[PDB]
Structure formats: C-alpha cells, structure tokens
Amino acid sequence: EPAMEPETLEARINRATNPLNKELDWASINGFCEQLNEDFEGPPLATRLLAHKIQSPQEWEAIQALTVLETCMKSCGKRFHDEVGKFRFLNELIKVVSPKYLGSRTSEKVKNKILELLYSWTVGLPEEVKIAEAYQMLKKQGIVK
C-alpha cells in the first residue's frame, strides 16, 4: 500500500534500489535521504527498510541500498546518524558480514562495502560510539583485517 504512494519512504526506496535499474538512480536516492528528514518517525523507518534491502540475496539490490545508506549518512542530519548508530541497525549489518549468519552467503563486494562504510563512520562520526564498538568487535573476530 505505502509503496503505491511515490512520496513514502517505501515507494522511494523501492525505486532507489530496484533490481531493474541499469544504473544508480540518484534522483530517487537523494529523494529518499531528503524525505527521511520530514517526519520524526522518518529515520527509524528508513533504517528498518534499508536493513532489509541490504540483506537481499540479489546483489544489485543490496548494493544500491548500501549506496542509499552511504549517501544519507553523508548528509549532516543528527537524527539519522543516531539511528544508524544504534545496535538495532548495526546488528543487521553485522549479520551480513558475519560468517555465523549471512556472511557465508553474501558476496565479497557487499561485505567489503559494509566494512568500508563502518570504518568511515568510526572516523567521521566518533560520537556514534556504538558504531566503533561494532567495528572493533568485527576486527577482534577476524572479520575486519
């Protein structure tokens, strides 16, 4: 239903990560990050949707979703940074890179992208201590070189 309303985060992310896209749809990607900051429940819904798309068996779907995540985090909004900086969301990324879960069934391209993003946040947003906690654990388990 919400996917039938072009302005909803659901409809936006379905376009921004559509497996049929021949190339990155920056219009939909930036539109998603923008719509994200319109409502108080926007950020929480965004991470919920992103987490699912990122765990998709269809690589191109997961890759575009990671591009959306990377792009929105690059925006200077505190609310979204804080939502991604919660284990509620970080655990979903851990499941993708961890061999104990989806790691053994996820491409190297996707897993590497997640690790690169996590690292960039540990450097650029040091105040999101939970992100650093998650990253350090991954390096302790041998996930991160």
Binding site: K86, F87, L90, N91, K95, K130, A134, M137
Partner: peptide, 7 residues
C-alpha cells in the same frame, strides 16, 4: 532505547 550488540 536500543538493543544489545550482536556478538
């Protein structure tokens, strides 16, 4: 709120 880290 939030949950615990997944080990």
């Amino acid at each position: 709120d939030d949950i615990s880290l997944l080990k």
